Amino acid sequence: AKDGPRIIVKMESSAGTGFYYTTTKNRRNTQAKLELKKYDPVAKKHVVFREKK
Amino acid sequence: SIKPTRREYISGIPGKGIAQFKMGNNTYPAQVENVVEKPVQIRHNALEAARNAANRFVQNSGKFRIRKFPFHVIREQDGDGMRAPFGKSVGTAARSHGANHDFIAWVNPDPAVEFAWRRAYMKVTPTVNIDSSPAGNA
Amino acid sequence: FHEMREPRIEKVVVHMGIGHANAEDILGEITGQMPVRTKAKRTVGEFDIREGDPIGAKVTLRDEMAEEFLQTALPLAELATSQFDDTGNFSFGLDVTVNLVRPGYRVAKRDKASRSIPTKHR
Amino acid sequence: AHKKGVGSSKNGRDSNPKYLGVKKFGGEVVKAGNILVRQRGTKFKAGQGVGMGRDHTLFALSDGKVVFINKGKGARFISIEAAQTE
Amino acid sequence: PMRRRREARTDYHQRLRLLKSGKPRLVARKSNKHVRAQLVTPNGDDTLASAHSSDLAEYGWEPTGSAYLTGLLAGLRAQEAGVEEAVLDIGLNSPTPKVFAIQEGAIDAGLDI
RNA sequence: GCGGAUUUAGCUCAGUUGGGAGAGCGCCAGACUGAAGAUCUGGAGGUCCUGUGUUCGAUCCACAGAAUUCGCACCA
RNA sequence: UCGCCUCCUAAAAGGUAACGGAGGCGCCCAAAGGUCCCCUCAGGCGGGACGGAAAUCCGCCGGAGAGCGCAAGGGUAGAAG
RNA sequence: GCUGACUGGGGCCUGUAGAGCACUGAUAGGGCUAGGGGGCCCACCAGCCUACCAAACCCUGUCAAACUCCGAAGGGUCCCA
RNA sequence: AAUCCCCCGUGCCCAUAGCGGCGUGGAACCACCCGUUCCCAUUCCGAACACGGAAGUGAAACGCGCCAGCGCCGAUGGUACUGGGCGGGCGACCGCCUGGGAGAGUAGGUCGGUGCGGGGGAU
């Protein structure tokens, strides 16, 4: 959305390639490169999602 | 009966700058007194005066206790003309609630005072009623 | 029933607390009931403004362990009057406070019917 | 390119809370009672509150929606008489 | 506050926690001495003495066993009644090895738990 | 009456974590001179406008209210 | 001065202008998120270290008045805490 | 095609006018009191007293649209007529 | 077995149950208790949570009973407000007619009442 190089930058994630992704907004704020959480590509179900973009 | 903005917001929480509540003196019996029966944003100053007026004419015994106090405020002219009214404040007063316990002249036997309040009376602003309380006056 | 009033150990507290890291270790060796309690304020009477700092240290010791101490250390103390105070409790040394315990005492902790401690039992 | 001061002049805007359905009316697993949105409905009726008593709305089906602390997170059931074998 | 709130210790409320539903406050009530458990199942329910360390004399097995059996038992007097799966009410304490005990009580009882 | 900005040590001036404050000029002691002055030596000195308020705390952040100086103001 | 959040104004459902009243927002927080486990505030009083406002600890008293990121209102410790 | 304004009844809502003080902010006579005073031993004394200012708690008293522990007048809505 | 005392878990009624003042009870009850290898457990001790058991004790939290000091509740008649209907002042406003009719203000009230079960105690 409102591209703010302020501590507010848009980002999303992938399912090891469960394929595509899903929607997230984030903050350099704390933890830089850091970004891991799990989901469910159209690919099967679940999977390791790394968020960086 | 329009009134003030927010007592912490337009003009709210003062000291209504005036001239306090008790002058005059003691006693157990005779209620000698002043009360009124008009309805109005009793005129701060006005009042204050009136009152201390009485004080003036007298000096001591005869409860010049005075049961009134101006606590809200009027407003008008300050800005562009007549249409959009920002807000200049003046006139701190109180709702004289159409009759009530105004100011007393309380004591055993001191008509000097009675007359005095009288004075304070003629004084005041809206006609007011001259009177006696629970027994009479002596 | 003298089988009441006449006492029984209930709370002894030993401590210290500089606006500041291990001195409390010294504590540790001395006893066995740690006491990491943050201290406060916001001004320079000792350069103590950082309103929020670990700096209050308090080795709580009631009964048992407090016995080890009442013993071991009661010797190094030297006053035995005055530093006696009212609510039946007292204190001295580089940070010591003890609390007598007449039998009404305990009522006071109750969340319920917390009798305001009758100044006649304590 | 800016705004001013010493001129409070600032209207406000709309809302629309309510006691939608009111107590004891044709019940219908629907927005039960409201004064607090992200509600977490509950069972049949409610009656706990910062005043005492309690509310019975003679109408029940699955459940309704509440008002964060206002009204009353129902739970003290009341499927109402009109809930016996057909 | 409110009665229970100016007081404390309680959380009768997480009691409510379960109150929502799931069948019955198979409630373990404990006072070391013994334990005694009842069944509060929603709808201004009631009970049925399913387990108590006195409905069959306070043995001398102390906790461990005591709870084991009284539990199994309650579970059974109960199924007799005709329940099925009940719901665990930690009358109090952090499911203390004791509660633990009553608990397997329903467990083995068959009392689904 | 409207706007913009300003009120700090005697004077002219500076600071946007706000975090805990001078710049040059004036003023007392020390010299250098027979003297004083210009000149090297030290120093002393501040409600950061009145009152509020948000604040851990802000004169540096906000809200009224004083004086500052500036703009303003037509149509027939 | 133009959008949104709260309060009053709305005469007691709900809802009305006004260049009427005051005041906040165009953020955030990867953990104030999920859930399981435990804690029960401010504040006052009394008593002691570095402490003489204003902590730290200990012992009482307590329709919760503290508290919740940020504004008001609602809430409400059974807790959102 | 009796379903409608309305009237009778019965729930179940609002919570201005009123009124009040424990929530809050006022506020006045006043008393307890400690902060400033203030006069006295000159006075680091932190010891003394007391007629001016006060906070706070109390008794007497008061006001509030953005206060309300209180609470109508009435309007609302489902249904029964 | 399915009658009353009693305690125990315990439920509805959001102080006519709270405060506090004295008192009573342990056989039975309960707590307090004893002790701490192992369960589990304190950001620190098993004070709380804890496991395992007498003796000790009712002190302490606890249950009925007495006390109105606070506290809570709370009427009659009673006033203001008012639904509605019509009259008097240029007046802010005054009044009357017809149902409604708070608080506060003295009575006076209360120191729970009541659910189910479990233990006993009444051959």
Side-chain angles (χ1 to χ4, degrees), chain B residues 111-132:
Chain B
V113 165
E114 117 62 270
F115 325 138
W117 240 186
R118 143 260 196 160
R119 310 178 184 175
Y121 269 100
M122 319 280 256
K123 153 47 240 161
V124 311
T125 94
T127 30
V128 183
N129 183 198
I130 321 96
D131 35 52
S132 303

Side-chain angles (χ1 to χ4, degrees), chain B residues 3-108:
Chain B
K3 297 304 178 176
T5 277
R6 268 232 69 300
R7 0 298 183 196
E8 323 161 357
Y9 301 46
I10 5 162
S11 50
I13 310 142
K16 74 186 165 181
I18 314 194
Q20 298 211 310
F21 258 41
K22 80 108 236 314
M23 176 50 253
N25 205 271
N26 216 81
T27 290
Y28 307 90
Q31 311 165 34
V32 190
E33 60 289 79
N34 121 57
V35 140
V36 198
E37 49 336 73
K38 265 290 186 162
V40 94
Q41 303 86 338
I42 306 312
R43 268 301 182 197
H44 70 110
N45 40 193
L47 343 175
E48 320 182 312
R51 272 195 171 181
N52 291 302
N55 99 233
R56 311 156 200 159
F57 307 63
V58 227
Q59 305 162 61
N60 57 283
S61 153
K63 266 204 160 186
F64 282 64
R65 260 203 295 161
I66 39 59
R67 301 164 180 182
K68 257 299 178 185
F69 16 50
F71 295 48
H72 64 336
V73 281
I74 346 184
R75 172 265 267 197
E76 51 308 286
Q77 188 160 269
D78 166 11
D80 307 304
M82 195 302 313
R83 317 177 197 187
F86 277 101
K88 222 180 171 181
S89 62
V90 241
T92 293
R95 190 160 204 173
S96 43
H97 91 168
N100 77 281
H101 273 81
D102 199 38
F103 328 135
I104 305 181
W106 224 77
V107 155
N108 303 293

